[PDB]
Amino acid sequence: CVNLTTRTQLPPAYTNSFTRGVYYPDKVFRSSVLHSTQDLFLPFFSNVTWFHRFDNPVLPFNDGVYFASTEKSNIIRGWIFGTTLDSKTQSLLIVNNATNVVIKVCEFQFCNDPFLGVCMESEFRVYSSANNCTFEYVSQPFNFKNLREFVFKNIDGYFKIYSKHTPINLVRDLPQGFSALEPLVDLPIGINITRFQTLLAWTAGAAAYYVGYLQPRTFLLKYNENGTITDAVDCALDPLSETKCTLKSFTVEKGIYQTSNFRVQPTESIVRFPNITNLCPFGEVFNATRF
Amino acid sequence: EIVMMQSPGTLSLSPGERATLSCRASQSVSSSYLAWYQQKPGQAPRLLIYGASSRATGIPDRFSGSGSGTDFTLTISRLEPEDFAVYYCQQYGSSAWTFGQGTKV
Amino acid sequence: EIVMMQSPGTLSLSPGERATLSCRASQSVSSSYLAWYQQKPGQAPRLLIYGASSRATGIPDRFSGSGSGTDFTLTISRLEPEDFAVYYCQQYGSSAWTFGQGTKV
Amino acid sequence: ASVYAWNRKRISNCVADYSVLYNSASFSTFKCYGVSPTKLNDLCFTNVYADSFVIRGDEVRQIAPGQTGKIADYNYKLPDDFTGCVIAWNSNNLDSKVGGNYNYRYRLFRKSNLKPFERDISTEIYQAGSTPCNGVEGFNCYFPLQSYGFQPTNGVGYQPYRVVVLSFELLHAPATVCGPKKSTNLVKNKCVNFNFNGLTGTGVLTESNKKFLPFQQFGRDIADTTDAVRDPQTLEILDITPCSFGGV
Amino acid sequence: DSFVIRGDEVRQIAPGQTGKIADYNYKLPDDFTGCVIAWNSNNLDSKVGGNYNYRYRLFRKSNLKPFERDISTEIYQAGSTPCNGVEGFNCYFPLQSYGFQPTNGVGYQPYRVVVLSFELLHAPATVCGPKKSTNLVKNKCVNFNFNG
Amino acid sequence: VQLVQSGAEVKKPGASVKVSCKASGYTFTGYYMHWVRQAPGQGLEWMGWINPISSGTSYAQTFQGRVTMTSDTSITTAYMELSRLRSDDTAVYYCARAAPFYDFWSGYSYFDYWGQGTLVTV
Amino acid sequence: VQLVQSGAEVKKPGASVKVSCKASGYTFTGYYMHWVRQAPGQGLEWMGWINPISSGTSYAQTFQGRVTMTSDTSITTAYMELSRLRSDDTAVYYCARAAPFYDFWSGYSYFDYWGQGTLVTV
Ligand SMILES: *[C@@H]1O[C@H](CO[C@@H]2O[C@@H](C)[C@@H](O)[C@@H](O)[C@@H]2O)[C@@H](O[C@@H]2O[C@H](CO)[C@@H](O[C@@H]3O[C@H](CO)[C@@H](O)[C@H](O)[C@@H]3O)[C@H](O)[C@H]2NC(C)=O)[C@H](O)[C@H]1NC(C)=O
Ligand SMILES: *[C@@H]1O[C@H](CO)[C@@H](O[C@@H]2O[C@H](CO)[C@@H](O)[C@H](O)[C@H]2NC(C)=O)[C@H](O)[C@H]1NC(C)=O
Ligand SMILES: *[C@@H]1O[C@H](CO)[C@@H](O[C@@H]2O[C@H](CO)[C@@H](O)[C@H](O)[C@H]2NC(C)=O)[C@H](O)[C@H]1NC(C)=O
Ligand SMILES: *[C@@H]1O[C@H](CO)[C@@H](O)[C@H](O)[C@H]1NC(C)=O
Ligand SMILES: *[C@@H]1O[C@H](CO)[C@@H](O)[C@H](O)[C@H]1NC(C)=O
Ligand SMILES: *[C@@H]1O[C@H](CO)[C@@H](O)[C@H](O)[C@H]1NC(C)=O
Ligand SMILES: *[C@@H]1O[C@H](CO)[C@@H](O)[C@H](O)[C@H]1NC(C)=O
Ligand SMILES: *[C@@H]1O[C@H](CO)[C@@H](O)[C@H](O)[C@H]1NC(C)=O
């Protein structure tokens, strides 16, 4: 393992998610319809943490994460998912190397500063010890030019990866507009995932990435004639979006619609019981000499 | 720690009679933690009474126990030649098991 | 039919040492159908190992087995005087049970 | 494995012949929940979780949905909507030793009940009272795991039983584990009873003009009912229409 | 209905049960009306070397419909290869005996089971409990019981 | 579990011999009874088996048509009848227990209990 | 329930002694093994205990730092190792079975089975 120290220490950046992060929630074709689904989605216009240099600490993984990268020269290498990441617990390693994509759910002893080096690939300094392998998979690969979006979920024993590749043309930002992420792979791996880390490929390259978090939300998805999702409504973004979901339409006529219910939520738990201290004589029942 | 004192140090009696032995403690003892053992000469000790008054499995009804607080007693209703042995009181407290000095019958 | 060949025909060693015996087969044999038996002189054979590597009930941990395909072995970690007996390998296949020629220890 | 640290063998991408296991004589308990044991060979599942452990005979009843005790609340909890089969057999001839086989263990204590399929392999001292234990075995501080002393002279309820549980996952995803069914030729433009990778129904199969994405296995109408299916052998998209009906 | 089974199998003589005695020897319907009376008969049915007269069906191609007796001894084909009447690999003998011994545990001791199925169809009743009849009273409001 | 066999027998060539094997400690009908021959100075040879529940048999080709195997569940005893004896049949005959073919684990591939051998001299 | 200890040992001052106690008739790991010392003409003194499931121990303050207690579940045997012997340690050493501390009834407060004593002379 090698610890890289020649790095400037700046605070994390933040950006606006806009309408990104919508994915196909299931494997069923439907077309020319509006479908209401309750699932883990990236909320619209959410605060997305933005990282650049060689900026890649371990981040929390809660219900799931949204990951996006803007690159021009293939710097991204992969991800580490796990609970402790130090061979004490099971961990998931996803690496896209020069020739293919490898997924391994072996028990890895990770480095405290993992990375790859490169133009041809040479260095691989991700882990040392690796035994107790449980799952392996290999497959086809995957201003700035390339935008890559991924959704990572860990539900009911499956780790679901969704992805979209698009062109980009901004120097320093995330595009506005709508696209849907198709599912890439469903891995049947029952891993407790609470933390993750990004693998990047001395000098620094030109690349940036964004990390958002999924929440339980209801989305109204618009399927076109060819069954492609072309729009969506986040049913809790604003009162209009809620109205659109309630009427199951993306067009709302003039009028007044009853769309929800307001309720004040409790902030404290008040527990009151009699101030008695004597214990019940259960022991005397159980340990009696004669029954 | 707690001092465990038995009385009398030596008992002398005839077969067929009743015997009472006593066990005293420096500090109050829960009835659930007091036990009596019989050790015959040349033999290992064997359990007679546990929980102050409960007979151990296999023990004749001639043996009985009683007591509370710091004062416990063991009574043998009728003695047979096999009963002329050393009797011990034992107690648990803190994280330790304390035995008395033993009484000879 | 399948020919069952054991090796060496005679083994010579001292008490306290380790022994390894081998069993070869003409045709591939599933691990589930291979067994080892110990026959002491003047006594009936008794089962030691079944399913290539599983010890029979009542067998000391000194006996172990391993193998696959056509090559199986029996290892005794340490020998006692009772272990100087004849060991046989047995296999099932087709609708018949075939035994080896036996090895003397 | 010990029940506290039970083994899971994920089973996928294969043909599952369940008639061999069900019609076997070697099994004493074979209880299925959510499916019937005699229809298993006609079904397809996305994934099968083969879970395996050794328990005491009296505890065999605890390997069921809705049960309470030590193995259920602390070693191998099953969900109430469990789909699968709990196959179990007496293994006294394999797992018993004269002095007791102390290799098989179970968790006896825990702060809370185990959620479904939650393995717990810790050995942290259990605090029974209000006083912190600080890692030391003593009063109100217990060792959470205990061994079963499996002896050949024990009664039937105390003999070891090996348990294999088979969890059948059913989510809207491609099925990978199917029974040993033979496939037939595809017939189009006629009313037939069809079974497409476990999906069953009656209808007329026609060639579809729908542009299915590479990951989509079937389709649904506005009504949220199945109206198209991808054939499991040739990646053809078929439309399913109901067989002709109407009032008389 | 009367038969001998193993003690652990006594629970199988109920509606909605699975196993070897239910699915292959004595299947009860789910709408069964009746009583399953059973008792330990170790003092009558056990022998020292094992009483091998009581048998049970262990194998069958399909489950027994309710109240369907099956007394055949046809060789059971476990695999894909026809057996042609010969006992061998994947070809089993469907029946097996219970080795009832006086030293067996309670779950392996013999239990004699008598099941009583009560048929209720719209027809004359012929089996009635030991009730006394009363005089017939007409033209008054009464609680009546006419043959059940 | 025990398997107690009859005592030694001496027969002339051409005769027939019957060797009893009495079983105890298990369900006799639940297992196949096998016979194994051991000529002096030689290894073990399998002869055949009997299924007590159906009185079904199978014999090794070497002994096919010469040996009959029977059983009596009432006295929990298996019998060997070897006919057309020749001088090459002098051997110690063992009875052994093997699980049936129905057994999910390959218990039929091995013999877990053996009786004391019966010496037959021809 | 039986507890069988090793035979008598004679040791010089400064040496260490190991006394075994083999258990049978019960689940070995389900109970605590305690050791009790009895000097000639004296009463019983508790030395400590070993929990076979976890190899956990506790020692009396009198013997803290001098005695090690171990166990081997495979052969169901407890061991005593007493180091730094002095002439005052000549005694009969007993092994005793007691319930674990999680017993709802105070089964840990008393010893229900004892082995035969091992005489150690120093
Ligand atoms: C029969 O059982 C009773 C009650 O049992 C008690 O409650 C049960 C639910 C379990 O938790 C038992 O383990 C528990 O003992 C016994 O009475 C109680 O015994 C405890 C143990 O000594 C007493 O606690 C002590 O109390 C003194 C004050 O007198 C303190 O100084 C000690 O530090 C300790 O806290 C408790 O007071 C006592 N309660 C009563 C009402 O007597 C009982 O001893 C037991 N008897 C037998 C023969 O088993
Ligand atoms: C990289 O830095 C980490 C600290 O952030 C090092 O980890 C420490 O290594 C020392 C060994 O010299 C241990 O004593 C510490 O306990 C470690 N701390 C942690 C938090 O793990 C790591 O060794 C460094 N890598 C290299 C190659 O020097
Ligand atoms: C990318 O990852 C794959 C998967 O680990 C690598 O393929 C293995 O490489 C090792 C090294 O020679 C071989 O021993 C294995 O047999 C390979 N396995 C397969 C399935 O191909 C591959 O080498 C990696 N590529 C690079 C450039 O590191
Ligand atoms: C995101 O959150 C951080 C932390 O409070 C805040 O400083 C930043 O302004 C937020 N970004 C947006 C776009 O609201
Ligand atoms: C694999 O996991 C087991 C835990 O069951 C552990 O005992 C073993 O040491 C691990 N393997 C390696 C190589 O550390
Ligand atoms: C995952 O691990 C953490 C420990 O970091 C633990 O608190 C949590 O309960 C675990 N979750 C599951 C589902 O096991
Ligand atoms: C559907 O696909 C066809 C090509 O297959 C294309 O011409 C058409 O524009 C698509 N429809 C929509 C709404 O995108
Ligand atoms: C079997 O299924 C696979 C699914 O990918 C398909 O590619 C292949 O052509 C099928 N083969 C036959 C003979 O149907």
Rounded Cα distance between C25 and C31, Å, is 12
Protein residue with least CA distance to atom 10, ligand 8? D233
Residue C81 burial (C-beta neighbours within 10 Å; 0-12, 13-18, 19+): exposed
User: Of the ligands numbered here, which is closest to the C-alpha atom of D121?
Assistant: 5
CA of A1 to the centre of ligand 2 (A): 10
Selected residues 33-92 of chain C with any CB under 8 Å from a CB in chain F = 33-35, 37, 44-47, 50-51, 56, 88, 90-92
- Gap from CA of G22 to ligand 7 centroid (Å): 83
Is B65:B75 a contact under the CB 8 Å cutoff? yes
Enumerate residues lining ligand 1, CB below 6 A: A 282-284, 287; B 30-32, 51; G 106
Query: Which H, E and C letters describe A12-31, residue by residue?
Result: CEEEECCCCCEECCCCEECC
Chains that touch E (3 or more CB pairs under 8 A): D, F
Per-residue DSSP letter, D101 = B
Q: Which atom of ligand 7 approaches the CA of D211 most closely? A: 5
Interface contact flag, A27 D117, Cβ < 8 Å: no
Q: Give CA A30 to chain center in angstroms.
A: 25
Q: F62: which 2 tokens?
A: 């070497």
Report which DSSP code applies to B61: T
- 3-class DSSP assignment, residue B29: coil
What are the φ and ψ backbone dihedral angles of C81, each rounded to 5 degrees? -55, -30
CB A218 within 8 A of CB A232: no
Q: Using omega within 30 degrees of 0 as the cis cutoff, is the peptide bond preceding C8 cis? A: yes
Q: Whole-angstrom Cα distance, residue G47 to residue G58?
A: 9
Contacts of F25 (CB under 8 A, 6+ apart): F1, F2
Residues D64 and D80: beta-carbon distance below 8 Å: no
Residues 24-43 on G with a CB inside 8 Å of B are 34, 36, 43
| Structural Rg of chain F based on CA atoms | 14
- Give yes or no for a cis peptide into B45 (omega within 30° of 0): no
For chain G, say whether A282 makes contact (Cβ under 8 Å): no
Residue whose entry in the numeric block shows the structure tokens 């009874």: F33
Please, are residues F51 and F30 in contact by the beta-carbon 8 Å criterion? no
> In this complex, does chain A touch chain D, defined as having at least 3 beta-carbon pairs under 8 Å apart?
yes
Shortest Cα–Cα distance, A287 to chain B (Å)? 9
Is there a contact between D25 and E62 if contact means CB atoms under 8 Å apart?
no
Q: Which residues of D215-230 are buried (b: 16+ CB within 10 A; e: fewer)?
A: bbbbbbeeeeebbbbb
Reported as type and span, the H/E element at residue A242 is helix A239-246
Judge C/D contact: 3 or more CB pairs < 8 A: yes
- Check if the beta carbon of residue D184 is closer than 8 Å to that of residue D164: no
Query: Across the interface, do D93 and C58 touch by the CB < 8 Å criterion?
Result: no
CA distances from D130 to A282, D139, D141, D145 (A): 19, 11, 10, 21
Which residues of C11-62 form beta strands (DSSP E)?
Answer: 19-25, 34-39, 45-50, 54-55
Residue G43 to chain B, least CA–CA distance (Å): 5
| CA proximity to G34, closest of G3, G66, G1 | G3
Question: What gap in Å lies between CA D241 and CA D221, rounded to an integer?
Answer: 11
CB F90 within 8 A of CB F40: yes
Asked if D212 contacts D241 with a C-beta cutoff of 8 angstroms, the reply is no
B72 beta partners: B23, B67
**How far is ligand 4, taken at its centre, from the CA of residue A44, in Å?**
15
Q: Report CA(G88)–ligand 1 centroid distance (Å).
A: 38
Closest-CA distance of chain F to residue C15, Å: 25
C-alpha span between D147 and D99 (Å, rounded): 13
| CATH number corresponding to A13-263 | 2.60.120.960
Interchain contact, E59 vs F27, CB within 8 Å: no
In the reported structure, the alpha carbon of residue A185 is separated from the centroid of ligand 8 by a whole-number distance in angstroms of 20
Ligand 5 and A134: CB distance under 6 A: no
Q: CB-based burial of residue D212 (10 Å sphere; 0-12 exposed, 13-18 middle, 19+ buried)?
A: buried
Sheet holding G17-24, edge to edge: G2-5, G17-24, G77-82, G67-72
Contact G58 D137 (CB under 8 A): yes
Ligand 5: residue whose CA is nearest its atom 4: A132
Number of C-beta neighbours around residue A225 at 10 A:
10
Tell me the two tokens of residue C102: 């036996």
Q: Give the residue, by CA position, lying nearest to ligand 6 atom 9.
A: A192
Structure obtained using: cryo-EM
Q: How many CB atoms lie within 10 A of CB A221?
A: 20
- Which residues 6+ apart lie within 8 Å of C70 measured at CB? C24, C25, C26, C27, C28, C29
Which residue type sits at A50?
Answer: W
Q: What's the CA-to-centroid distance between A33 and ligand 7, angstroms?
A: 16
Q: Considering only CB atoms, which chain F residues are within 8 Å of E52?
A: 28-29, 52, 73-74, 76
Q: Between chain E and chain F, how many beta carbons pairs sit less than 8 Å apart? A: 54
**Do F and C make contact, counting contact as 3+ CB pairs within 8 angstroms?**
yes
C-alpha D123/C-alpha A129 separation (Å) is 25
Backbone interruptions in chain D following residues (C to N > 2.5 Å): none
Give the largest Cα separation in chain C, rounded: 40
Residues E56 and E5 sit within 8 Å (Cβ to Cβ): yes
Listed as own residue / partner, the contacts of G43-49 with beta carbons closer than 8 Å and 24 or more positions apart are G43/B88, G43/B99, G43/B100, G43/B101, G43/B102, G44/B37, G44/B45, G44/B88, G44/B90, G44/B99, G44/B102, G44/G94, G45/B99, G46/B96, G46/B97, G46/B98, G46/B99, G47/G80, G49/G98
Backbone angle region of E50, left / alpha / beta, with phi > 0 → left and psi within -120 to 50 → alpha: left
What gap in Å lies between CA G50 and CA G70, rounded to an integer?
7
C58/D98 CB distance under 8 A:
yes
- What kind and span of H or E run contains A285? helix A283-286
What is E51-86 written as a DSSP string? B-S-EEE---SSPPPTT------PPEE-SSS--TT-
Q: Does B contact C via 3+ CB–CB distances below 8 Å?
A: no
Tell how far the Cα of D163 is from the centroid of ligand 5, in angstroms: 23
Q: Which residue minimizes the CA distance to atom 8 of ligand 2?
A: A112
What distance in Å separates the CA atoms of residue A53 and residue A75, rounded to the nearest whole number? 12
The one-letter amino acid code at A1 reads C
Chain B contacts to A (CB-CB under 8 A): 32, 51, 53-54
Cα–Cα distance measured from residue G49 to residue G94, given in angstroms and rounded to the nearest whole number = 12
CB atoms < 10 A from the CB of D157, how many? 14
Q: What are phi and psi of D112, to 5 degrees?
A: -145, 165
Cα separation of A129 and A21, whole Å? 36
Instruction: Count how many pairs of residues, chain D against chain G, have C-beta atoms within 8 Å.
Output: 53
Which-ligand-closest: CA of A83?
6
Phi (first) and psi of residue G61, to 5 degrees = -60, -30
CB F30 within 8 A of CB F107: no
Residue of D183, D234, D235, D236 with the most ligand 8 atoms within 8 Å of its CB, for mutation: D234
